[PDB]
Every structure is written in C-alpha cells, then in structure tokens.
C-alpha cells in the first residue's frame, strides 16, 4: 500500500498538491545532477550534422555510434 503525500513547490509563494511518494523520490533523485547523469545516444544522420559545427566531436561521436554507446 502506497500512501499519498503533500508535495510543495516554491520558496516564498508555495503551491501544494498531492503526489505519489515514489514519484517524488524519483524526482529528487534526478535532481542529484552529480549522481544521475543524462547520456546521449547518436544516429548516423545526427553525427554527420555535428561535423558542420565541430569536426573533432564528429569523429569522437562516430566512435560512440559505432559501438552503440550512451555516453
């Protein structure tokens, strides 16, 4: 059984709603930017477009794409 919780947002002007305890835990976990990290996945179409702005990144991005890495 999962209890409902109050989730509040804002510092001086605070808005309160009801929310899921697990969903709030995930939300705060994703706010730990140093721990949980976004990672990029490429496709050949977008790797080619990168070269128009950074040639070095295109070569490195190609390596990531060839190995199917989320990096």
């Amino acid at each position: 059984q999962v209890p409902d919780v109050f989730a509040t947002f804002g510092w001086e002007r605070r808005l309160t709603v009801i929310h899921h305890p697990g969903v709030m835990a995930i939300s705060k976990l994703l706010d730990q930017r140093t721990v949980v990290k976004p990672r990029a996945t490429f496709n050949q179409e977008l790797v080619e477009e990168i070269g128009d702005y950074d040639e070095d990144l295109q070569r490195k991005a190609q390596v990531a794409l060839d190995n199917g890495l989320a990096i």
Binding site: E49, G51, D52, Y53, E55
Partner: protein
C-alpha cells in the same frame, strides 16, 4: 492566426565551410537566404520605395515627354 507549414523548400545545410569549397553559386545562395528569412519582409520593405519611385520617374514620360506633344494649341506655329 492560422497554423501553416514552413514554406522553405531549399537546402537546409550546405555542410561545414571548408575554404568555400562545394558551395552553391552566389546568386543561388542569395535566393536561398531570402527563402530562409522570408520574402514577405523583402516585398513589404521595398514596396514603399518602389511605389514612390515608379510614380515620380513615370512623370519623365507621362508628365514631360507626352506633355511636349499634348498641348493641342502648341503644334500650330504663328505666321505659317
């Protein structure tokens, strides 16, 4: 307004600039630029001057040349 699609049908990317190689002709590039930024501004911006210029310069023929042969009481020379 009425939601509509982007009307630009030209090339979305020329590729990385490499000492100006493998790029379209200059006039093609100018046309693509105006296509990309909209012809409505070009027509709107130039419309006022085109209208004023056409009207003033049209007087060269409508007000000056024609008029030289407009006065019906001028072709007649005196003592002739």
């Amino acid at each position: 307004h009425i939601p509509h699609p982007v009307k630009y049908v030209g090339p979305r990317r020329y590729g990385r600039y490499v000492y100006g190689m493998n790029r379209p002709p200059v006039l093609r590039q100018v046309k693509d630029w105006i296509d990309w930024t909209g012809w409505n501004s070009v027509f709107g911006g130039f419309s006022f001057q085109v209208a004023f210029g056409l009207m003033i310069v049209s007087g060269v023929y409508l007000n000056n040349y024609r008029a030289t042969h407009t006065l019906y009481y001028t072709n007649k020379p005196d003592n002739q």
